[PDB]
Amino acid sequence: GSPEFMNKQWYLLANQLILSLSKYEGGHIFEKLVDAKKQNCPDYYDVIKNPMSFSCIKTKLKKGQYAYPSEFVKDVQLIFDNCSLYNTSNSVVAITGKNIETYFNNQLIVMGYNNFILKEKKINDMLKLV
């Protein structure tokens, strides 16, 4: 397809997808960066050195700071990885995090978003062939 047209497309799906995650059940705990004091987890940024939240990703989208479709997924997946790292598997937060992660990955399938990630790869090979 048209290269800039494609970029407009997956940008639209990303902005849609981050919004669905904000409204999904429990998504509000990933909306903002954790305030270690107000959540009384005062060791959070001793454990999590690469913090990420839905609002950070929204700002990147708004600022046009994603060059590839995989870069958006990587940031969302980072939220889920921080969540499972910090919270024990039998905790409310860990369980909530795995529920949103399953939903995010399934939206990637339903929305055709993964085809944009596949496209990104072959273009970079097509560029390697030059």
Ligand X SMILES: Cc1ccccc1-c1[nH]c(C)c2c1CCCCC2=O
Check residue 39 for interaction with ligand X (CB under 6 A): yes
Q: How far is the CB of 111 from ligand X (least distance, A)?
A: 24
Check residue 15 for interaction with ligand X (CB under 6 A): no
Q: What are the angstrom distances between the C-alpha of 89 and each of 79, 80, 81, 125?
A: 15, 12, 12, 39
Q: Residue 79 carries which side chain, given as an amino acid letter?
A: I
Q: CB-wise, 94 or 111, nearer to ligand X?
A: 94
Buried b or exposed e, range 60-70, using 16+ CB within 10 angstroms: bbeeeebebbb
Q: CB-wise, 28 or 121, nearer to ligand X?
A: 28
Check residue 87 for interaction with ligand X (CB under 6 A): yes
Q: What are the residues binding ligand X (CB under 6 A)? A: 29-30, 34, 39, 41, 44, 83, 86-87, 93
